[PDB]
Amino acid sequence: ASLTEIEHLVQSVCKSYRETCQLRLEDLLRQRSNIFSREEVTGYQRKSMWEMWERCAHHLTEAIQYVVEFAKRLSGFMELCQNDQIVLLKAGAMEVVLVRMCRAYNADNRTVFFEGKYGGMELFRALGCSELISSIFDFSHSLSALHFSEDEIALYTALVLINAHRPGLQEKRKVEQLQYNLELAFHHHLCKTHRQSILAKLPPKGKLRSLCSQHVERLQIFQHLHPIVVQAAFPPLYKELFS
Numbered sequence: 001a002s003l004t005e006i007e008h009l010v011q012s013v014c015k016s017y018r019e020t021c022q023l024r025l026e027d028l029l030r031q032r033s034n035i036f037s038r039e040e041v042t043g044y045q046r047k048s049m050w051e052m053w054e055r056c057a058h059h060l061t062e063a064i065q066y067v068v069e070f071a072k073r074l075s076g077f078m079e080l081c082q083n084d085q086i087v088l089l090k091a092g093a094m095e096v097v098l099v100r101m102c103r104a105y106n107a108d109n110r111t112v113f114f115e116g117k118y119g120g121m122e123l124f125r126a127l128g129c130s131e132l133i134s135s136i137f138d139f140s141h142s143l144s145a146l147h148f149s150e151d152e153i154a155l156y157t158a159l160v161l162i163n164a165h166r167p168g169l170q171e172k173r174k175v176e177q178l179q180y181n182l183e184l185a186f187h188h189h190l191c192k193t194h195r196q197s198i199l200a201k202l203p204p205k206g207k208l209r210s211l212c213s214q215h216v217e218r219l220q221i222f223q224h225l226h227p228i229v230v231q232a233a234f235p236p237l238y239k240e241l242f243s
């Protein structure tokens with residue numbers, strides 16, 4: 001792919017990203033001052049496990065749905081057979097959700113933006129997932145240290161999804177090519193901005209995968225104990241994770 005194609009791919013990917021973000025980043029930064037009372041905290045901490053899970057589960061569900069809309073706008077994704085779109089999304093939608101979190105994370109006070117204000121991990125205590133939730137906070141913190149631009153997150157998460165080494169693909173070669181193109185675009189943009197050095201500092205893909213595995217497993221257990229009701233946007237994908 002030539003320079004102009006690459007530039008068009010970067011612009012396209014970053015526009016798709018911005019347009020499939022729940023909240024714009026300026027909002028998240030405006031509100032880092034708006035922090036939860038200890039009264040508001042204990043309020044959340046005195047919530048029942050189920051009502052808290054319902055909140056978080058619906059929040060996370062909505063997030064996955066924005067990520068699916070992002071994928072559907074990646075050049076070439078819609079041209080993929082339904083099987084492969086499910087393979088890519090089953091594996092990666094939640095990996096992207098986990099990456100997108102670093103936006104709502106404030107490494108200064110170690111808090112995250114949740115339901116209108118910032119709170120520490122203490123806020124989710126009623127779920128009793130301290131291990132998992134501590135891990136997630138560690139990951140966001142780790143991503144914070146890289147000071148991603150919005151453009152970098154867009155290209156990085158595009159590559160999290162468009163990965164040709166996911167088990168199950170049938171058009172593996174078509175994915176390899178969309179991936180190659182996204183890698184040229186990511187690398188170009190990083191060079192352009194003197195940020196090429198972050199490539200070696202990105203999370204090892206294994207760490208992202210395994211963390212996503214822990215997280216989804218836990219969520220599936222909770223979905224078993226206490227099903228929330230989902231109006232699904234990609235039914236063949238929903239059926240692949242909720243059954």
Ligand SMILES: O=C(O)c1ccc(-c2nn(C(=O)c3c(Cl)cccc3C(F)(F)F)c3ccccc23)cc1
Nearest residue numbers: 057060061064093094219220223232233234238241
């Ligand atoms: O609306 C949809 O079409 C749709 C909506 C959501 C998903 C989706 N949920 N999910 C979960 O982890 C999940 C969530 Cl976010 C909330 C409650 C329970 C669950 C669980 F049971 F599946 F585990 C995923 C993981 C990986 C990939 C896609 C998804 C998929 C499809």
Ligand SMILES: [Mg+2]
Nearest residue numbers: 191192193194
């Ligand atoms: Mg240069």
